[PDB]
Amino acid sequence: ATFLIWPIYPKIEANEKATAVWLQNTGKTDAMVQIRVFKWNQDGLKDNYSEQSEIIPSPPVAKIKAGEKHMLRLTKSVNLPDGKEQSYRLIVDELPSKVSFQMRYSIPLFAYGKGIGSGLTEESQKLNAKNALAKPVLQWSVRELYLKNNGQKFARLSALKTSKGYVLSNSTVKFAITAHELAKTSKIYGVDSSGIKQELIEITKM
Amino acid sequence: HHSTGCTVGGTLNFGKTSGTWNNVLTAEVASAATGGNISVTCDGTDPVDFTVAIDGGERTDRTLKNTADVVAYNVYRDAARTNLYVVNQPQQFTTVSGQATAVPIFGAIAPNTGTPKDYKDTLLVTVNF
Numbered sequence: 001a002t003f004l005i006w007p008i009y010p011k012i013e014a015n016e017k018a019t020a021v022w023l024q025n026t027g028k029t030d031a032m033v034q035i036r037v038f039k040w041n042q043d044g045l046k047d048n049y050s051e052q053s054e055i056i057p058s059p060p061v062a063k064i065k066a067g068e069k070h071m072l073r074l075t076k077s078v079n080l081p082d083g084k085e086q087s088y089r090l091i092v093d094e095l096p097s098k099v100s101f102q103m104r105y106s107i108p109l110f111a112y113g114k115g116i117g118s119g120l121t122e123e124s125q126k127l128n129a130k131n132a133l134a135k136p137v138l139q140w141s142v143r144e145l146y147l148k149n150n151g152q153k154f155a156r157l158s159a160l161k162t163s164k165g166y167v168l169s170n171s172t173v174k175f176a177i178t179a180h181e182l183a184k185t186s187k188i189y190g191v192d193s194s195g196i197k198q199e200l201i202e203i204t205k206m
Numbered sequence: 207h208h209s210t211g212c213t214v215g216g217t218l219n220f221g222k223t224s225g226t227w228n229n230v231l232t233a234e235v236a237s238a239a240t241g242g243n244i245s246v247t248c249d250g251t252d253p254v255d256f257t258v259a260i261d262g263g264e265r266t267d268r269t270l271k272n273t274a275d276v277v278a279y280n281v282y283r284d285a286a287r288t289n290l291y292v293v294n295q296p297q298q299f300t301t302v303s304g305q306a307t308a309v310p311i312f313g314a315i316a317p318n319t320g321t322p323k324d325y326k327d328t329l330l331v332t333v334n335f
Binding site for chain 1: 330
């Protein structure tokens with residue numbers, strides 16, 4: 001089946017009780033989906049998921065007829081820890097000699113505590129301007145290339161340049177590699193799409 | 207601020223796989239003209255990166271079961287089948303502004319020739335944004 005998913009980068013601000021993701025069956029046949037939210041971290045240089053009770057999806061199961069647009073509600077159970085960005089994945093499982101396909105769609109979901117925001121709105125931009133750590137702060141080293149985020153916000157990098165995926169907050173991520181090109185400078189640069197527009201951020205050597 | 211939306215979506219039939227066969231069995235979900243395919247289209251103006259991982263099937267080894275005997279198969283990103291969809295491992299894609307990025311899936315079964323045999327399996331295709 002065919003789905004339009006909007007927005008693809010949902011988030012819940014500190015002052016917001018819930019957000020909405022819209023699922024529309026843009027196809028000709030009916031579809032049945034399961035909606036789940038898992039907590040997301042990058043401990044041990046790997047993406048880890050786990051059951052969680054902070055963000056509640058509604059409904060957990062939905063029959064989406066052809067053409068029908070459904071509103072998925074993502075509700076915060078309680079307020080989140082101050083000044084911190086929580087990471088989640090929203091999982092949409094499409095339920096059904098030949099081998100057939102079962103589609104699973106995964107999009108990031110971020111939720112904020114007091115004092116930090118997404119930076120996708122004026123309100124949250126003025127918030128993060130008062131916070132020195134409300135941004136990705138990436139350091140790099142070579143073992144493969146390691147990226148350590150010391151800021152309170154995630155980075156989403158499309159490319160790395162010697163001259164001008166996800167790295168969650170307070171996390172270190174490993175990438176396969178350019179190593180001599182790495183050992184030839186001190187700062188590299190990454191194209192980050194975590195904010196309102198693509199921007200180069202400075203990555204300093206560890 | 208422009209919120210990106212993306213359209214996603216939206217069967218490898220190897221034919222009869224009973225008995226024996228001397229050549230490679232092939233099937234594909236890669237083109238609208240070939241029957242249809244999986245694709246991703248996002249409404250923004252900047253490219254959107256995403257990842258496709260395919261599991262190992264009902265038995266995690268990618269084999270079709272008779273429902274009464276198995277037959278090993280694999281799924282590739284490539285018609286020449288040089289680029290395997292290695293089980294559960296991400297495969298990198300990127301969208302182009304205003305255009306559909308296909309997620310092509312090419313299936314193959316090695317020649318049997320010796321040892322004669324419905325056959326079904328379900329693959330989980332995970333698209334990660």
